[PDB]
DNA sequence: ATATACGGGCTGCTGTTGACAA
DNA sequence: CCCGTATATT
C-alpha cells in the first residue's frame, strides 16, 4: 500500500529528467571505476532510489545483507560506534571473492566534526575494499576536508514535461479516469517534488472517484488562478471597503488560507509592470505579512493589513 | 494581605455579589469544566477560588499541611519544591523552578491525576511559564478530564497560548471601584477601634490605586505611626519610588555623558534591590511624561513601547534602558534649544 | 461528565465538516491502501477525535494495547526514545483477529500529537523510520503550524487542512444538543452565540453548558451570552475614538487606564476597534496607517509584551492620524 | 583499482608542483640530513602529507619500517596510551649511519586535546639527539603556543593556474586523452585552487563522453557559485532591484537552500569594496534575515524582502 | 503457549549461556530438535551454541520453529538468582513458557520452598550472516587441549593491535605472535606432545587477526576441555569448543572470525 | 620575564651567522641582511623559533608565529580608531544626501581583532559597553551606538540558535561603535588628548549574581520571580518586626538604599 | 642622543556527546 | 592602545 513507496523504481532505466548523470553512473559501473559520491539536492528528487538501484544492480540478491552497510539518522553515529564497526568492516577480507564493499551513509548532515574527520581518514586510507556514498541536502554542514575528495553530483528540481509520463503510467496501472485539466493542475501543484504529485492523486481518487481541476483544488484547498486574478483586479482599482467586503465574502464562501494567496500575489506583482519603488514597498510589506503569520495571531487583521499595504501606493499612482 | 479580616464564605462579600451567585449556582451541581480566573492584581481572585473550593467540598479545607518534594532532572540534578497543598485540594506554583517547571508539571500532575469524586489542582501565576510546559499541561488536562479539575489563576491573559485559552472557561474579576474600597476600609478599621473620616479614606483609596491589599497595608501602617488622624496627614511611600523620582529629576536637569554614567549606576543599584525592569520602565515613563506637553510626548511613548518589546525579547536589560535614556535625552536637548 | 467528553465522536459518521478526509477514511476502511496522514489547522475543528474514532472502529476497544500507541506532549520525547522504542514497536508483526468475526486491517497505527514541539534531531530519525517499515505501520502526524516541521517530514505525508466550522452546521449541531439536553433556546441567542464563538465547537459547547447551568433551565437571551463571553459595550468603545479625535494626551491616557482597570483583554479591544475602523467615513490613507499599526500591536502583544504601553502607542498614532 | 586522485601520487620530491621555496629548501635538507621539527599549514588539496612522507622516505630509505612512527585521527590519541607509546619510541635506541634520525609524524594534530599536547611538549626537547618531529595540519590556531615556540612554521598557499595546467598536461599526455584549450580552461576554472578536485572533475567528464569540450564539461557536472552573488551585490548597490531579483530567482530554481545562499552572501559581503555605512546596514539586514530563516520561515518572499530592504538604503 | 520447557538443573543452561556472553542481545531458534542461540558483532565475528533435546525432560513445541530476540544480561542474571555457589546437594528448578508472538517470556524458579516469578518481554528479530564452514574447503585443521593455553591466552592481553597466527608442517608448527609496545612475544607449540591429538596441516598459512574481535574467546576457553582450530583457503578462522555438565553430557560452542 | 629586545637578538644572531661563515667548507650563500631583521620581526621575542628559522633559511617570512593581541590592547585598538588622511583612491562615495556620513579611510579589520583576542563575543560586547562611554564627546553618537549595541544583543536571546549566529552581533557592535564616533573620525583631529587612562571590568556580573542569590533568599523565605516583583514591594512596605534573628537583617537590607 | 623597562586595568554569567581517573 | 621617567651606552 501507500503508493509513494509502492511504485518506487527498482532499476536505473525507470527514472526521468536527469539523463547525463545516469549515463555517467552507468559508465562508471561498466568500467568498475565507481568513486565516492556526494549526492545533494532538494527534497523529493530520487537520490536514495538511485543509490539503492545501483546497489541492487551491483550485487546479487543473497549478498545484499553481508556486503552492504546502511547507517541512517535513526541509528547511532558517534565515534566509537564508527571507529570500531567500520574499521573492522574494512578489516574484513571480502567474502564471495567478488567486488568490494559499500557503506551507505544517509542523512550525512547529522554527524559531528570528530566523526567526519575520522571518516575522512577512513575513506582516504584504503580505497580498495570500501566505497562510501554520502547523501545530503545542505552542503554547509559538511567539513571542507571531506568535501574535496568525493565527486559532487547535483540533482536539480524536476520539470513537468518528463514528469507527466510516469504519472500517466501510474494512472493506467490502476483503474483511474483522468482528464486534461486534471493532469495540468496535479502537476503544477508540486514544486518539483514527485512525492507530492503521487500522494495527492491517491488522496483525491479515494474521495470522489474521478480527477479534475475542480476535484483536486477542492481536495487540497489551493485557490484557483482566476480567483487570484479577480482578487488582484479588485485590489488595484476599487475602493477600500468594497474590496474588503468582496474578498471577505469570497474567503468565507470557500475557506481559503493566506499563505497561498500571498505566494500567488507575489508572483503576479513581479509579473506586472511597476515603477520600481512601488514594487519594493509591496515586497517589503508582504514579506512582513508572511513572517507575522507564524506566531499565533489573527488572520483577518493580517488580510486587512495586506489590503491596506497594497491599496494606497497603487491608488495614488 | 493582612489575612486577619478576610472572609471565608460566599456570603457577606463586600463587592461583586452577582458573579458570586452565578458561581454558587454552578458549583451546586458538579459537572464542571476547567476554570481560568483573570483580572487586575488586588481584585481578590484567590479568595473566590478558595471559597469555591469550600462550597464544593465540606469544611476540610481550613488546614495547613505545608509539604516539600524533591524530584530529579533527566541526568542527576535535583529540584526542591514546596506545596501548601492540604487535604483534597493541591496547590503548586511552578515558577520557583526557573527551567524545571516543565518536568515539575509533568511529574507532579501525572502523579496526582491517578491519586465529590474528584480533586482540584491549582496552578498559581501561569503567566511566567515557557511554551513546552503549557503544551504538556494542556494535553494532560485534556486526557484525564474525569477525576480532577484545574483552576488556573493569573492576570493579563495574553501570555497563555490560544489552545489552553480555548480549552476552559474564563472568569474575570474587575477592580472594586473607589467608594467600595473606602467603605471596606472604614468598616475594617471601625471593627478595631478608632475610625476613618470620609476624606481620609477617599484620599487613601485614590492614592492606593485599585489594590485593596495595598490600601489596607497603607492604612494599617499609618495607624501604627499616628493614632489621632487629621485631614492633612500624608501616607508613607516605599524607598524604590522616591529613588526613581530622584533619578528622573536628575535625568533631565543636565544632558552629558557623565550624567548618563551616573544614571546608569543608579539603575544598577535599583536593580540590585530586587525591582524588576518592567516596573522601572513604567515608573520612568510616568515621571518623564509628567511634563512633556508636545509631540515629543507621543514620540517618547512610542519609543518606550519599542524598548519594552525589546527588553522582553532580549536578555540584557541595561542595554535597552540605557538606549531609551539616551534617546530621550537627545530628544529633550534638541527640543530645548529650538 | 461534562458535555464535551460525552458527545465525543465515537464513529466516522459523527464529524460534521471535513468531507474529503472522512470520505477517504471510509473508503480506506472497507478496503486497503491507506497512506500516511498529516493533520493541521486551527483549534476546535477535530483532529484527535477523527483518528481516535477511525482506530476504534478499525480494531476495537479490546485490541488497543498491541495495535496503537499515542505519544503526547507529556511523554519526554528525545532522540533516544525515537531511536529505540519507536523502531522496536514498528519492527513487530501483526497479531491475530478480534472476538466478533469481522475483517481486519493488517497494520498498526502510531499517533503522535504536538509534533511541532519536538526538535530537528529527533525529526530526522522519525522521517527515516517510516520508509523501510511501510508494510505494517502507518503514521498520523498532528500539528498546528506546518512551518515548524522539516521539509522531508511533510514531503511524505498527505496534508489535510481543517477549515474553520460554518454557521449553519454549528447551528444545527447546537440545536441537536440543546434538544437532547432539554434546554430552551432562542432563535436570536444562538445566532449571536455562533458569531461570538468565532468558529469553535468546544468553545460553543462550553458556552451552552455554562449558560444552561447558570440560568437553571429557563430561557436564555443574548444578554446572558454577552455577560458570559465578555464583549466590550459599544458605548464605552465609542469614547476611545471620541477622545482620540481631538483634545489632549491626558484624556486619552485616562480612558485607556480605566479600560485596562476594568480588566478587558486587549485582544478583544483590538478586534472590536478593527471592525469600527473599516466601516466609518474616513480616508483610505488613514485607514491603511491605522490597520498597519493595529497589526503591529497585535503581533507585539502575541510576543509577550506589555498591555498599557502598547494601547497608549496605538491610541497616540490614532490621535496623530485623526488630527491631520 | 584506485581512482585518478589517489593513483597519480608523486613518489619523489620534484614532482610536487606547489610552492617553489619551501620545496627546494626541503630537498636541500633531505640532501644534508639535519632537519628540525617542522609544522606545515595551508589550504587543502596541496600535498603537505605527500611532502612529509616523501621527505621521510628519502631520509631513511630501506630502514623505514622499523624507524618511523605515524599517527592519525582515526587512531586513538588520548593522553595515556599515546604518551606511553611515544616515550617507548623516543627512549628506544636504534642505529642510524651518519645523521638520519627517527621520525614521528602526527597528521592533523589540531584534533588533539590540550592534555595530549601538554604531555607531548616535554618529549620534544630532550631526545632531539636521536629523534625529530613533523606535523601537518589545516588550522594552525589550534596548536598551543608552547608547541609552536620551538618549531619551524612553514605555510603553503593555493596553487595558481600555471602549475595546475602543466601537471594537467602531463596527466593528459600520460593517458592520451584528446583535449581542447577552452575545455581545460573551464576545468581549471571549476577547480578553484584544489588539485585533487580538478583531477576528479576531469576524470568524471572523461568517464562517458570521450571529449573535454566545454559543453561536455558543463553538461556532466559542475559550476562555481560565489561569482554570481558578487555581481548580485553590485547590482543591489545601485538600487536595481529588478536586475537583482533575476539572479536570486535563477539560483532558487537551480536548487539551493536559503541558508547556503545567505551564508555565501555574508561571506562575499565582508570582503568587498564599499563604504562603511552601507556595509553596516547590509550586515544588519542579513543578520535579521538569517535569524528569520533559521527560525523556520523560509521562502522566496523573505529573500525578495531582503533585496528590497538592501536597495532601499541607497534610495 | 507455543513452547514450554522445564528443567531441574539451571546450571547447565546458565554456563552454556555464560560461555557465549559478550554482547547485550541474542537471537533464539526453537525447533523440534532444540534451541540455538547465536550472536554477531562487527559483521565479522559470530558465536553460536547448541542445546539438544537430550538434556531436557519436559520440552513442548507447537507447529513450526519459533524465533525471538532476548537481552542476554537480564536473562543470565535471572537464571542465577539463587547464588552461583551451591553446596553439593542443593538444586534449583525452572519452568519457562512463551505464548506466541507479541507476548513476553515467563520464568518460574523454585528451590527449597522459595518460588520466584519473572517476565522478559522480547522485541524481535534481527538478521544473521551466512558463515558456512562446511568441511569441504578446509585445508588446515588441528585438535588440542585447554590447560596448555589457559595461561597462554591469559598471557595474551597487552596493548597490541594485531595477533599473528602461523601454522606450517615444518619448523613453527603452531606459532602465535604479538607485537606490542615492549617487543615481540612468540609462543611456539610443537607436535608430539601431551596436547597434540592430531596434526594434519597441509600448506603453510600465516595470517593477521584483530585483538578486539578475538579477545572474548577467553570465556569459552576457560569452561572447556578441548579445542579445535580450522582455517580454509581464504583464511577464515573457525573455533570449536566442547563443554560438559555435572550430569555428564556434552555441548558445543562455535566461533567464526574473519582475517584482516 | 619580558621578551628579548631586538638589539640583543640581533647581536646574537650576527654572532651565530659569523661563526657559521667562518666554518668555510664550501661556497654557501650567507643569508641576506635585509631578511635577517625580518626573521626577528615576526617572532615576538622568542629565541628558539628564531634559531630554527635561521637554520631553515640558511640552506639555499618563514616562522610566522601566530599573535595573541593581548585583549586589553585589542580593546584600545577598537576604541582609538587609527585613521588615515584619505589617500586619493576610487572608493565609493555617498552620492547626494548622505553628506553627514562621510568618513576617512580606516586601517584596521575588526573581525580579525576580535577573533585574535580568543574571547567569546558576548563578553567582548560587555567590555565594549563598559568602556565605550568615556571616549565619546557628543550625545547623538552615543544614542546611535546604544541602539546598535541593543540590536546586537537582540540577535542572541534564544538557546537553540544562539551559537549559529554570533559573529553578526560582535561585528555589528564593533562597527557601530567605531563608525558612530564622528568627532574622532576626521583624520588629523586627534591633537591632543588620550591621557594615561586605564580600562576596567564589567559590573553586570556581580549585580546578576546578587540578583540570583537574592531571588533564592526571597523565595525559600516568603515560597507559598513574581514574589520579588509583587510580594517584595509588600515587603518593602512591611517594615514591621517578626520572630527570627537572621531575617531582620534581610529586611533591613532591601529597604535602606541611600536617599536624602 | 637613543634603546629599553615600570606604572594600571581581566577568570566571568533547558539537550547530546566525549575524555579521565579509579 | 596611551604618557612620562630612570638607567646603559656612545
Ligand atoms: N525522479 C524520480 N523518479 C522516480 N521516482 C521518483 C522520483 N522522485 C521521486 N520519486 C518517488 O518518490 C519517492 C519519495 O522520494 P525519495 O527518493 O524517498 O526522496 P529522497 O530523494 O530520498 O529525498 P529525501 O529523503 O527527502 S532527503 C521515491 O521513493 C520514488 O518512488
Ligand atoms: N469580599 C471581600 N471583602 C473584604 N476584603 C476582601 C474581599 N475580597 C478580597 N478582600 C481582601 O483582599 C485581599 C486579598 O486580595 P486577593 O483578591 O486575594 O488578591 P489575589 O486574588 O491573591 O490576586 P493575585 O493574582 O493572587 S496577586 C485581602 O486583604 C482580603 O481581605
Ligand atoms: N469536527 C467536529 N465534529 C464534531 N464534533 C466536533 C468537531 N470538532 C470538535 N467537536 C466537538 O468538540 C470536542 C473537542 O474535539 P477535539 O477532538 O478534542 O478537538 P481537537 O481535535 O483536539 O482540536 P484541539 O484540541 O483544539 S488542537 C469533541 O469531543 C466534539 O464534541
Ligand atoms: N603540490 C601538489 N603537486 C601535485 N599533486 C598535488 C599537490 N597537492 C596535492 N596534490 C594531489 O592531491 C592528491 C591527494 O592530496 P593530499 O596530498 O593527500 O592532500 P593533503 O596534502 O593531505 O591535504 P589534506 O589532507 O586534504 S588537509 C595527490 O594524489 C595529488 O595528485
Author numbering:
A (entry chain G): 20 to 336
B (entry chain E): 4 to 118, 127 to 349
C (entry chain D): 38 to 361
D (entry chain F): 35 to 349
E (entry chain B): 15 to 274
F (entry chain K): 287 to 346, 386 to 549, 555 to 590
The authors write:
The RAD9–RAD1–HUS1 (9–1–1) clamp forms one half of the DNA damage checkpoint system that signals the presence of substantial regions of single-stranded DNA arising from replication fork collapse or resection of DNA double strand breaks. Full catalytic activation of ATR at sites of ssDNA is dependent on the RAD9–RAD1–HUS1 (9–1–1) heterotrimeric checkpoint clamp preferentially loaded at a 5′-recessed margin by a specialised form of the heteropentameric AAA+ Replication Factor C (RFC) clamp loader in which the large RFC1 subunit, required for loading the homotrimeric PCNA, is replaced by the smaller RAD17 (14,15). The presence of the 9–1–1 clamp loaded at a 5′-recessed dsDNA–ssDNA junction, is communicated to ATR localised on RPA-bound ssDNA, by the scaffold protein TOPBP1 (16–18), whose BRCT1 domain binds to a phosphorylated motif in the extended C-terminal tail of RAD9 (19–25), and whose AAD-domain binds to and catalytically activates ATR.
Here, we have determined the cryoEM structure of the human RAD17–RFC2–RFC3–RFC4–RFC5 (RAD17–RFC) clamp loader complex bound to the closed 9–1–1 checkpoint clamp and engaged with a dsDNA–ssDNA junction. While some fusions completely disrupted assembly, fusion of RAD17 to the C-terminus of RAD1 significantly stabilised the overall complex, and delivered material in which all subunits co-purified, which co-migrated with a dsDNA–ssDNA junction in electrophoretic mobility assays, and that showed the presence of both clamp and clamp loader in negative stained electron micrographs (data not shown). For cryoEM, the purified samples were mixed with ATPγS and a DNA molecule that folds back on itself to give 24 base-pairs of fully complementary dsDNA capped with a tetraloop at one end, and with a 24 nucleotide 3′ overhang at the other. The structure of 9–1–1 in the complex with RAD17–RFC is essentially identical to the crystal structure of the isolated clamp, corresponding to a ‘closed’ conformation which closely matches that recently determined for the equivalent yeast complex. The other major interface between the clamp and clamp loader is provided by the RAD17 and RAD9 subunits. This is the most substantial contact between the two complexes and is mediated by the interaction of a linear segment of RAD17—an α-helix 194–205 and the following strand to 212—which bind into two distinct connected pockets close to the junction of the two halves of RAD9. The core of the interaction is provided by Tyr206 of RAD17 plugging into a pocket in RAD9 lined by the side chains of Ser46, Glu165, Cys218, Ala263 and Leu265, and the peptide backbone of Phe217 and Thr264, and by Leu209 and Met211 of RAD17, which together fill a pocket in RAD9 lined by Val41, Arg45, Ala47, Tyr48, Leu132, Gln133, Ala134, Val135, Val261 and Ala263, positioned in the equivalent position to the PIP box binding pocket in PCNA.
